[PDB]
Structures are given as C-alpha cells and as structure tokens.
Amino acid sequence: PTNHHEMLQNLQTVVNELYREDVDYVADKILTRQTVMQESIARFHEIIAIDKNHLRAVEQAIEQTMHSLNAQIDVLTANRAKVQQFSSTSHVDDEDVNSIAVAKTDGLNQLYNLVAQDYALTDTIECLSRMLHRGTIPLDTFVKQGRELARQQFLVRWHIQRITSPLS
C-alpha cells in the first residue's frame, strides 16, 4: 500500500538518521574517555612500585643506621669513661700547661730554664733601673744589686755556652 508503505518508508529514514546521531554522540563523548585510561593506570602502577622500593630502601637504611648509633654510643660511653678516668687516678696537673708540654730531654729542659733566667735577669736589672729613676731606691743600692744580677747573668751565659760549645 503506497500509503502505508510510504509511512513505513519515512520511519526507516527517521530511524536511520536517529541511529547515525546516536553513534556520533557515543563516539565523540564516550568512546574517547578510554583513550588514555590505560596510560593512567600504568602511571599509577609505576608510582606504587617506586614508592614501594623507596619504602624498602629507607626501611633498611634506617635499621642499619640505628645499629650504628647503638654501637657508636658504646664506644663513646667507654672512651668518655677512660678520659674522665684519666682525670682522677692521674694528677692532670694544675691548669699550667707548662707541666704538660715539656722538653724532650732533661738536657733541653735545662737549656729552656737557663735561657729564661738570662732574659729574666735583664728584665730585673731593667726594672731596678726604673726604680732608681722613680726614686724608689738610691744610686747606691742600684749599683750593688745591679752588679750582682749582672754577674749572675755572665755565669748563666757561660753555662749555656759550655753546654752548647761542643756543637761545631
């Protein structure tokens, strides 16, 4: 029936077009969403693995480092004991480091003292000179004591000289 036939014909066209439009929408707004849906999951898989490893690394790293501490402390509590012990049953001297840092030999120690005495002798004569200028002592006194310290000096220099003469 051309009538009933043409209507059915119209139905086909509306239906085919309605179908095209359906496919079009799905392919543009839905089927696209999976494009990089795998890459996403992939990226995440990559991340956990990394975190996982990092976690194991630090895990071990911290454990070993802890044993180093509980060990580095025993060799510390010990040495600190031996050091704080040396300061008891061993007179660590009056703060004068002089007693600690000494000459390599008794001979040398002697030399240091003679040298010191030599200078110290001048200083003393120098000072008494000043004392005379200030008027603290008369010329009479300065000469006597002066000649004495100057004399004791000649000896000290000869002494130093006789210990070092044999050295040519």
């Binding site: 799905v26 839905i30 969403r33 849906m37 996403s40 995440f44 991340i47 990394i50 975190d51 990092h54 976690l55 630090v58 790293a61 911290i62 480092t65 180093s68 501490l69 580095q72 060799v75 510390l76 040495n79 031996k82 050091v83 040396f86 061993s90 001297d93 007693s99 600690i100 840092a101 000494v102 000459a103 390599k104 040398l108 030399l111 240091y112 040298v115 130093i160 070092t164």
Partner: protein, 79 residues
C-alpha cells in the same frame, strides 16, 4: 739565636705518652631520611575510579533503552 733556634727547632712533648686521651672517635653524622607522600596520589585516584564508574552507569542507561522502548511499544500497539 743559636740556642734560641736549637730550642724551637726541637719539638715539645706531652708529659704523658700514650696515657693522654685523644679523639679516637669521629662524629657520626646521621643520614637524611625522606618518606614519600601517599595521600595526594591516593586522592588523585578517586576521580579516576569515579570516572569509570559513571561511564559504566552511562552505558547501562544507554543500553537499557531498547527494552524500555519495547515495554512502551507493547501497550501502544498490542494487547
């Protein structure tokens, strides 16, 4: 100078030999420790999961359309 030199030319010693304490221990410096962040990434997953879930629902809705039509198509042109 002669004696002066000789004296200084020879090194001084520490009254106590090996009895004098020394720093035989070095400072053990602790290494740097960093634990990775997880919460941010954890949150970034929700939306990705949710996207999939909604697409799913969209497909069900879409795919369930033919049946809804048949039910209607029946009452309309049938018993």
């Amino acid at each position: 100078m002669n004696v002066e030199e000789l004296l200084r030319r020879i090194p001084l010693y520490n009254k106590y030999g090996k009895d004098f304490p020394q720093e035989t221990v070095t400072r053990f410096q602790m290494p740097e420790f960093k634990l990775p962040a997880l919460q941010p990434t954890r949150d970034l997953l929700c939306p990705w999961y949710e996207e999939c879930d909604n697409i799913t629902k969209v497909c069900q809705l879409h795919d369930s359309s033919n049946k809804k039509f048949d039910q209607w198509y029946k009452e309309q042109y049938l018993s």
